[PDB]
């Protein structure tokens, strides 16, 4: 959206 990390479905959001 605006908004999110914009990563692909198999990614685990990073630190």
């Amino acid at each position: 959206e605006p908004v999110d990390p914009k990563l692909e479905p198999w990614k685990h959001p990073g630190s």
Partner: antibody
Amino acid sequence: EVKLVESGGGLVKPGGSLKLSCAASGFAFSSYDMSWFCQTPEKRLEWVASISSGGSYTYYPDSVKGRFTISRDNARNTLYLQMNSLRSEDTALYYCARDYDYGVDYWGQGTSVTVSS
Amino acid sequence: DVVMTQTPLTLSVTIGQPASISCKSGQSLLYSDGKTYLNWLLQRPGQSPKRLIYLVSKLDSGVPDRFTGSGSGTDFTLKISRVEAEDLGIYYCWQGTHFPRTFGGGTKLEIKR
């Protein structure tokens, strides 16, 4: 300007090792996942490895899993690919790329690897 | 593992004319979150790949909007409304929905003369 500059390619024997790097500049390196891709002599493109912005998560397809290691130095804006147990099939032009916008946005210039005895 | 198939393999086009490239995946690229991670890129001879399209039809801001992407499911199309001489190169589609990322084999666009 996003800029990615790979180096370290060359001729290597089957079974041997090589370490590639990618010098990133023009952006906040630490914020982005990064990836390696390669282009074969037949102009096939293939995904090689990806690493999370922070460093903790690494992802590899079966073809390289167990042989290559992707790692990154957030302090020096540098991405690496440690290639072990090279195979003739690994012969390719290797590109560093930035993961963003639901995929990949910028590619580097490539560094060439030939695996041959 | 997701098979990506592009058609045609080569496409010969006159400058000013439209062109259309197709990309078909072996299974659906729509993910549960309602997004479809289907991408297009161009590699000009002797150059690095350049992003053209992401999430099916979102346009890279360096690319003129004579390029459009459309489709859903397993069927995708890149269209060029009017070809220019600098479009010469190999167009690839690729998917990031299913691990591992996979590429179509490329469509070579050549300029008619």
